[PDB]
Amino acid sequence: KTHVQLSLPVLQVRDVLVRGFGDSVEEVLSEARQHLKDGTCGLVEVEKGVLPQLEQPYVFIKRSDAAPHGHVMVELVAELEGIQYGRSGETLGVLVPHVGEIPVAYRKVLLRK
Predict the structure, then answer these.
(1) HSE-CB of 14 using CA atoms within 13 angstroms
(2) Which of 45, 48, 84 has the alpha carbon at shortest distance from 76?
(3) What residues does the CoV Nsp1 globular domain cover?
(4) Beta bridge partners of 83
(5) CA gap 78, 22 in Å, rounded
């Protein structure tokens, strides 16, 4: 399937144990896709002071369309030193590995895979 229905655990930035996916744009996009498939991917909602507490490169989910079955359609964009790799809509949040942190909520998404 070109799209996969996922429910992403929403984590508080200060609970996150593993604060990024890796060390290159290609690696973080790779790792993010693997974690999304394996159900080991969390989402941190971006507010003032969040991103400086996470590791670059960042992986964002961005709205790719204006929402089947409640699931917002999203795609991945990475960022490193203010340059983004990809083009998409509004940020739903930043992806991080999930290693058993308790979420505050779930974000239903349809991921272009």
Answers:
(1) 1
(2) 84
(3) 2-113
(4) 80
(5) 11
Tokens of 5: 């229905």
Domain with residue 62: its CATH number is 2.30.30
Residue 16, token pair as written in the block: 């996150």
Full DSSP string of the chain = --EEEEEEEE--GGG-SS--S-SSHHHHHHHHHHHHHHT-EEEE---TTTGGGSPSSEEEEEE----GGG-EEEEEEEEETTEEES--S-EEEEEEE-SSPPPSEEEEEEEE-
Tally of structural domains, the chain: 1
Give the structural domain span for 82: 3-112
Instruction: List the determination method.
Output: X-ray
Q: What angle do CA 42, 110, 25 make, to 5 degrees?
A: 55
